[PDB]
Design an enzyme around this catalytic site. Structure first.
Site, PDB file in Angstrom:
ATOM      1  N   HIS A 228      36.044  35.430  45.135  1.00 35.41           N
ATOM      2  CA  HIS A 228      36.713  36.688  45.333  1.00 35.41           C
ATOM      3  C   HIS A 228      36.965  37.361  44.329  1.00 35.41           C
ATOM      4  O   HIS A 228      36.951  38.655  43.966  1.00 35.41           O
ATOM      5  CB  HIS A 228      37.880  36.509  46.292  1.00 35.41           C
ATOM      6  CG  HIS A 228      37.599  36.242  47.722  1.00 35.41           C
ATOM      7  ND1 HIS A 228      36.307  36.334  48.271  1.00 35.41           N
ATOM      8  CD2 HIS A 228      38.535  35.615  48.622  1.00 35.41           C
ATOM      9  CE1 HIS A 228      36.210  35.904  49.444  1.00 35.41           C
ATOM     10  NE2 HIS A 228      37.421  35.412  49.881  1.00 35.41           N
ATOM     11  N   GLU A 232      34.969  40.783  42.794  1.00 35.72           N
ATOM     12  CA  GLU A 232      35.665  41.912  42.231  1.00 35.72           C
ATOM     13  C   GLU A 232      35.713  42.441  40.856  1.00 35.72           C
ATOM     14  O   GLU A 232      35.643  43.772  40.605  1.00 35.72           O
ATOM     15  CB  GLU A 232      37.346  41.777  42.787  1.00 35.72           C
ATOM     16  CG  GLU A 232      38.149  43.126  42.411  1.00 35.72           C
ATOM     17  CD  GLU A 232      37.693  44.244  43.382  1.00 35.72           C
ATOM     18  OE1 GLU A 232      37.289  43.850  44.635  1.00 35.72           O
ATOM     19  OE2 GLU A 232      38.083  45.464  42.895  1.00 35.72           O
ATOM     20  N   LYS A 235      32.238  43.709  40.282  1.00 38.36           N
ATOM     21  CA  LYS A 235      31.866  45.146  40.700  1.00 38.36           C
ATOM     22  C   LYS A 235      32.256  46.129  39.950  1.00 38.36           C
ATOM     23  O   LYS A 235      31.709  47.269  39.682  1.00 38.36           O
ATOM     24  CB  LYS A 235      32.654  45.147  42.334  1.00 38.36           C
ATOM     25  CG  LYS A 235      31.754  44.713  43.281  1.00 38.36           C
ATOM     26  CD  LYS A 235      32.385  44.795  44.825  1.00 38.36           C
ATOM     27  CE  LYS A 235      33.705  44.314  44.913  1.00 38.36           C
ATOM     28  NZ  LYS A 235      34.226  44.610  46.257  1.00 38.36           N
ATOM     29  N   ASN A 236      33.566  46.027  39.373  1.00 37.49           N
ATOM     30  CA  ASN A 236      34.262  46.854  38.480  1.00 37.49           C
ATOM     31  C   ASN A 236      33.377  47.024  36.972  1.00 37.49           C
ATOM     32  O   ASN A 236      33.164  48.037  36.656  1.00 37.49           O
ATOM     33  CB  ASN A 236      35.717  46.650  38.129  1.00 37.49           C
ATOM     34  CG  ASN A 236      36.645  46.768  39.160  1.00 37.49           C
ATOM     35  OD1 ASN A 236      37.055  48.129  39.214  1.00 37.49           O
ATOM     36  ND2 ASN A 236      36.926  46.079  40.354  1.00 37.49           N
TER      37      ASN A 236
HETATM   38  C1  LIG Z   1      35.743  42.443  33.239  1.00 41.04           C
HETATM   39  C2  LIG Z   1      36.324  43.783  33.157  1.00 41.04           C
HETATM   40  C3  LIG Z   1      36.062  44.680  34.407  1.00 41.04           C
HETATM   41  C4  LIG Z   1      36.554  46.018  34.378  1.00 41.04           C
HETATM   42  N1  LIG Z   1      35.914  47.064  33.602  1.00 41.04           N
HETATM   43  C5  LIG Z   1      36.397  48.295  34.015  1.00 41.04           C
HETATM   44  N2  LIG Z   1      36.091  49.281  33.332  1.00 41.04           N
HETATM   45  C6  LIG Z   1      36.731  50.492  33.576  1.00 41.04           C
HETATM   46  C7  LIG Z   1      36.416  51.594  33.024  1.00 41.04           C
HETATM   47  N3  LIG Z   1      37.665  50.488  34.515  1.00 41.04           N
HETATM   48  C8  LIG Z   1      38.165  49.203  35.125  1.00 41.04           C
HETATM   49  C9  LIG Z   1      37.476  48.455  34.680  1.00 41.04           C
HETATM   50  C10 LIG Z   1      37.273  46.644  34.888  1.00 41.04           C
HETATM   51 BR1  LIG Z   1      38.907  45.871  36.320  1.00 41.04          BR
END
Ligand SMILES: CCCc1[nH]c2nc(C)ncc2c1Br
Ligand SMILES: CCCc1[nH]c2nc(C)ncc2c1Br
Ligand SMILES: [Cl-]
Ligand SMILES: [Cl-]
EC number: 2.7.11.2
Lengths: 341, 341
Positions: A228, A232, A235-236
């Site tokens: 999980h 998550e 995905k980001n």
């Molecule tokens: C492993 C890091 C994952 C990650 N990368 C991101 N990039 C942006 C622009 N916003 C939020 C996130 C997040 Br949460």
């Protein structure tokens, strides 16, 4: 009814946090079913009552909302279902059979709590505002309520999965290969990324086994929790990487490092998705600021903290972002972290 | 005397934090000397009195110690020296000359405050113990006291350096090349590392100028502050790298990335010096746990926070450690951060 009396009674007890070793003992065989039953019929009404007492201490403008009243009614009905088994004979196999069925019912009854609680946050934002003080109180409550939800579902899953009439012990894998869990979460995120964006970054995994180099990194853990968190984060990282390179052709990969130390097992995920200004980092873990007309990151961090770990984010605006999952390497140090009541 | 009355009076005022733009205006020419004088003769007794009032609110077991009484006496004498100039005519060039000399005296009088305060922390540890509550109160006090010390010395340095009878504006470089400051701090740390260890890691610098790739990264900043932070980090990274590879031949380099975003200028330093368990990370910034029978890291973080930045550490036990200095990229966002009284 007696629900207020039960809450008052069982909330005088402190929850008993369990270690990985204790979990592996409750699940070592089917003979332990009676022991798991006599433990849970007392421990579950303690954990339920403690969070139900905290829910009753919320301000009246929060407590009287339909979402909180709906969640409360579920935790009242669940509390009462466990109360029925307090006088039953553990030696009667029928009692044990009924108990397991009751736990499955309880688990399903609460399946939509996280979306139900998000509706409440949005209602609060529009009814009273999104000020910092409100953010802190909501964050404090939901972190503890969601941490309390995780610990209860863990107990229930361990009982229902093991005592159903082995390498894995319920939801615990005593030989969890972290890199295998990292490659599963990536593949799932990739499948979604290809459908939505028609393009996806590649994956690069490196392991650092300090004490025994070249040896695969294994641990005792709950792979569904680890999945999980990584899913998550993937995905980001994929959304950021793809969207920040829509006007270019090269697509940097997502790099994962899995390090095993004397007491930490650390997993760093690194992307080049443009990064986030420091000012906006904490908003990513805020329930209130993440609610718009999901909660993956704040809940992911709770999964990490649940066994004395953590999940931290560090970005470099204009370049990319790192996320580190900190886990305990040793089963002796992997102990439930429960809300301090 | 009237020292208690002065503290009470000037502590009713809030310190006025200045932006980089305001600093560059006070130093734009020598004609501004009179303006700097009339501002400082009021602002310095406000900032002195505010921290002196907080010092008087310390518990009696801390306040009555020789270290706190010694520091207090310095801040009383310094307060009174500024009081003499409140009635003097700014149009008299002699008044301005005397004021500058008085500030140099004040600066020198306080030169040994940081070692004097460390002696107090050690005394407390041995006299009353090193419990968590004490750690928090000491950390809270010293972070504010050291942040208050930094802001006062900044004001004094800007006046004494500019009005002494240009590209740089006192201690501020409006075209500070961050990579040039990174290479200076490394070279100094390397010189010490070679003397003590007869071996030193190499340096690798990469710049990411998101808006204008390939263009050197410049900013408005105080290079001495940036040097102090990077030097402290380099010393720790070199010690860790060398000591963790005493039994091997390869010596991994220290990597620095300098990223320029829309509002952040971020500097990440990465080593492979074996890392630190998460449990021990916060101790690295603790005054009490860093005191043994120095304070480089906690003070370094205060330099970063002083202009709305930060300094964060993320390690991977068994591999290495990252440190990120977060600075504001724009002079408009670079405003003094002063202790909230
Ligand atoms: C492993 C890091 C994952 C990650 N990368 C991101 N990039 C942006 C622009 N916003 C939020 C996130 C997040 Br949460
Ligand atoms: C850039 C990171 C610098 C760094 N490296 C470290 N390694 C160990 C073992 N302890 C503390 C530190 C610090 Br501070
Ligand atoms: Cl729930
Ligand atoms: Cl001082």
């Amino acid at each position: 009814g007696s629900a207020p009396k039960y809450i008052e009674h069982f909330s005088k007890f402190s929850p008993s946090p369990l270690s990985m070793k204790q979990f592996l003992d409750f699940g070592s065989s089917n003979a332990c079913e009676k022991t798991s039953f006599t433990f849970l019929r007392q421990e579950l009404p303690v954990r339920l009552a403690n969070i139900m007492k905290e829910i009753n201490l919320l301000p009246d403008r929060v407590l009287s909302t339909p979402s909180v009243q709906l969640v409360q009614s579920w935790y009242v009905q669940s509390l009462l279902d466990i109360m029925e088994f307090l006088d039953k004979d553990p030696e009667d196999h029928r009692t044990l059979s009924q108990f397991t069925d009751a736990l499955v019912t309880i688990r399903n009854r609460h399946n939509d709590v996280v979306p139900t609680m998000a509706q409440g946050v949005l209602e609060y934002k529009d009814t009273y505002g999104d000020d910092p003080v409100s953010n802190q109180n909501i964050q404090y409550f939901l972190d503890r309520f969601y941490l309390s939800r995780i610990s209860i579902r863990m107990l229930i899953n361990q009982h229902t999965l093991i005592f159903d009439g082995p390498k894995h012990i319920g939801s615990i894998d005593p030989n969890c290969n972290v890199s295998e869990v990292v490659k599963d979460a990536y593949d799932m995120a990739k499948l979604l990324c290809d459908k939505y964006y028609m393009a996806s970054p590649d994956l690069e995994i490196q392991e650092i086994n300090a004490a025994n180099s070249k040896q695969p990194i294994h641990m005792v853990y709950v792979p569904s929790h680890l999945y999980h968190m990584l899913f998550e984060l993937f995905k980001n990282a994929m959304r950021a990487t793809v969207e920040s390179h829509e006007s270019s052709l090269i697509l940097p990969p997502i790099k994962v490092m899995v390090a095993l130390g004397e007491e930490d097992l650390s997993i760093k995920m690194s992307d080049r998705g443009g990064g986030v200004p420091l000012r906006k980092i904490e908003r990513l873990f805020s329930y209130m600021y993440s609610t718009a007309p999901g909660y993956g990151l704040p809940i992911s961090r709770l999964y990490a903290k649940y066994f004395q770990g953590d999940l931290q984010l560090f970005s470099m605006e204009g370049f990319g972002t790192d996320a580190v999952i900190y886990l305990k390497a040793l089963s002796t140090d992997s102990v439930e972290r429960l809300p301090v009541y």
